[PDB]
Design a protein around this ligand. Structure first.
Ligand SMILES: *[C@@H]1O[C@H](CO)[C@@H](O[C@@H]2O[C@H](CO)[C@@H](O)[C@H](O)[C@H]2NC(C)=O)[C@H](O)[C@H]1NC(C)=O
Ligand code: NAG
Ligand code: NAG
Ligand code: NAG
Ligand code: NAG
Ligand code: NAG
Ligand code: NAG
Ligand code: NAG
Lengths: 163, 99, 49, 254
């Protein structure tokens, strides 16, 4: 090992790594990418191996320092602790509902209105009812007899389609 | 509605036709901080290495290992892996690593 | 217990809904009750089973 | 170094009632104001828990079978109990787990110790006597952690060894009762989830001598065994387990 040696006689430090899996809990593993956390959006969340799809909002549940997950009565994960920053997030499920079409007879008219049940109007002639978001019906302050039932005291009729 | 009721004429009323399932926008993966990293600097950047008749063996366990820094280091004249890949090394969890 | 007749109807409906959601946690003889675990752990020829 | 202690007084170990102790959190899941039924390795309510003393001349360090899980209760003052020994044969033929808390730091090791027949710690009246093992050949795991630790402290521990994972659940309770276990409810929070992956069938706790021969400081501990059963756990508005029901105790709780 003199410095004037040619390549093939020069000293080479060699490290050999041997990896093995046994009948034991495995613990050496590569780092897992932790992306930025976003809120108030319907995303596919993956918290420490717990996967799913839901809107992650800020939570008022004060967890104990050892507890990580949160379940309701029906064994669905509705709360989680972020591992990066020690904070609590609620998982509301992503917005879903039925899509119903309110129409008069096709002999009368071809105008329709669309009811998105249990859906807020900001994430779908747009009117917010307790039954859901109603698009295509003009809301009036006058009260009439129920022609087409919408629900929660709301009814639709044709005169354009009014609700 | 005409396709749902299987008719070209629709009577007056409300007819449930479909479902509005909001689609997920992004994917968020959150994991704890990378801490208790493996002592690869104690093996690789040692001041004096052993001789080959008395080769040092170091048991490695309970740590997270970044092989991507080792692969991305251009100072290594030889990097041969015979049953794994660097992406596989990042995605396989192993019980024991013997250096 | 004056209004027990309405309360029995409410309790039966809530119990039926609760049992319906509890049935999602059963694997029914499969390897797991989660579809995503089956799609991530197995090839499609056994995943279809 | 090993020393036989030959000034013991022969006495059978005692037995007493578990009351509603030995309960721990079964998982890492927050639950609020709900009742949850679990089938886990639990300690039965009002069970026969074995009682060992350290008093002066009683110095109780026998070696007990681990079974499926161990509840360890410690009515402790001045920190006589320092750690535990787990294994199958407790020699260099098999591999053994050692848990100690000396005067500085908490050490967890998995080695093939050649253990003494009577291993102990010792405090001179300063701690200057360490007789636990005579050798340690093949060490596969090391883990250094934070300090875990009239009788003034109740220290409750639950050790489980399931799927190569050794779970330590712990709780510290300020008590002021003189002799027996207090009657009350206190859920044990999980302390350490430990990746050892070894066979454990027998354990032995470690005491500390006082030198001025040797003197045993006043301490008392209790050993109970876990069996697979269901408890109905109550979770309050803060997510803390306040009450539990043993479903196989009596028909009322059933
Ligand atoms: C303390 O007592 C134990 C038990 O009597 C001793 O263990 C014995 O050690 C001898 C040494 O040759 C063996 O032949 C026996 O088979 C052992 N018996 C048991 C039950 O293990 C122990 O060695 C004693 N300690 C010291 C320092 O003498
Ligand atoms: C992880 O890093 C974050 C970065 O802000 C820091 O706030 C936190 O204290 C670190 N540790 C843990 C255990 O989360
Ligand atoms: C060794 O030294 C090199 C030279 O600067 C440095 O870049 C590297 O981070 C050190 N550690 C390892 C593990 O290579
Ligand atoms: C506890 O067990 C001992 C013998 O092992 C027995 O003498 C005692 O009566 C038992 N106590 C109860 C409450 O069963
Ligand atoms: C664990 O030890 C017990 C007693 O020493 C033995 O009967 C059993 O077979 C062992 N189990 C394993 C998996 O080695
Ligand atoms: C406690 O044990 C550790 C591990 O053997 C040791 O490093 C430390 O010096 C010990 N403390 C005392 C006071 O001897
Ligand atoms: C355990 O130690 C003995 C004696 O030191 C040695 O001969 C044996 O090879 C070791 N086994 C392992 C698995 O390290
Ligand atoms: C829950 O915590 C609050 C503090 O926010 C406390 O006032 C209340 O007493 C706790 N609940 C119980 C049952 O102790």
């Amino acid at each position: 090992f003199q410095p004037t040696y040619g390549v093939g006689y020069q000293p080479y430090r060699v490290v050999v790594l041997s990896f093995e899996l046994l009948h034991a809990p495995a613990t050496v593993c590569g780092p897992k990418k932790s992306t930025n956390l976003v809120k108030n959006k319907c995303v596919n969340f993956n918290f420490n191996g717990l996967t799913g799809t839901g809107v992650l909002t800020e939570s008022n549940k004060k967890f104990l320092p050892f507890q990580q997950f949160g379940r309701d009565i029906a064994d669905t994960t509705d709360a989680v602790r972020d591992p990066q920053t020690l904070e609590i997030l609620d998982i509301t499920p992503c917005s879903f509902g039925g899509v119903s079409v309110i129409t008069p007879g096709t002999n009368t008219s071809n105008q329709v209105a669309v009811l998105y049940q249990d859906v807020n109007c900001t994430e779908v002639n747009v009117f917010q009812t307790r039954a859901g978001c109603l698009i295509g019906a003009e809301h009036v302050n006058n009260s009439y007899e129920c022609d087409i039932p919408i629900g929660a005291g709301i009814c639709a009729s044709y005169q354009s389609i009014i609700a | 509605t005409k396709c749902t009721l299987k008719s070209f004429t629709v009577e007056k009323g409300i007819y449930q036709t479909s479902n509005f399932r909001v689609q997920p926008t992004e994917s968020i993966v959150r994991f704890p901080n990378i801490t208790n990293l493996c002592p690869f600097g104690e093996v690789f950047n040692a001041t004096r290495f052993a001789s080959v008749y008395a080769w040092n063996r170091k048991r490695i366990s309970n740590c997270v290992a970044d092989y991507s820094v080792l692969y991305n280091s251009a100072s290594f004249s030889t990097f041969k892996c015979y049953g794994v890949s660097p992406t596989k090394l990042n995605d396989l969890c192993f019980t024991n690593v013997y250096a | 217990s004056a209004l027990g007749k309405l309360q029995d109807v409410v309790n039966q409906n809530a119990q039926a809904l609760n049992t319906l959601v509890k049935q999602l946690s059963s694997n029914f003889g499969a390897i797991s009750s989660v579809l995503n675990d089956i799609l991530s752990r197995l090839d499609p020829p056994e995943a279809e089973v | 170094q090993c020393v036989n202690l030959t000034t013991r007084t022969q006495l059978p170990p005692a037995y007493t009632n578990s009351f509603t102790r030995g309960v721990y959190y079964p998982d890492k899941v927050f639950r609020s104001s709900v009742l949850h039924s679990t089938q886990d390795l639990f300690l039965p309510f009002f069970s026969n828990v074995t009682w060992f003393h350290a008093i002066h001349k009683r110095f109780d360090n026998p070696v007990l079978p681990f079974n499926d899980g161990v509840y360890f209760a410690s009515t402790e003052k001045s920190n006589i109990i320092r750690g535990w020994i787990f294994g199958t044969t407790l020699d260099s033929k098999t591999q053994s787990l050692l848990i100690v808390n000396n005067a500085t730091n908490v050490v967890i090791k998995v080695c093939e110790f050649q253990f003494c027949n009577d291993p102990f710690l010792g405090v001179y009246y300063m701690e200057s006597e360490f007789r636990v093992y005579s050798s340690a050949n093949n060490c596969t795991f090391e883990y250094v952690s934070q300090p875990f630790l009239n009788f003034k402290n109740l220290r409750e521990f639950v050790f489980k060894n399931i799927d190569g994972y050794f779970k330590i659940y712990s709780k510290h309770t300020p008590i002021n009762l003189v002799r027996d276990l207090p009657q009350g409810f206190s859920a044990l929070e999980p302390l350490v989830d430990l990746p050892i992956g070894i066979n454990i069938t027998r354990f032995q706790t470690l005491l500390a001598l006082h030198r001025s021969g040797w003197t045993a400081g006043a301490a008392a501990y209790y050993v109970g065994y876990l069996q697979p059963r269901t408890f109905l756990l109550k979770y309050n508005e803060n997510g803390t387990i306040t009450d539990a029901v043993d479903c196989a105790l009596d028909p009322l709780s059933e």
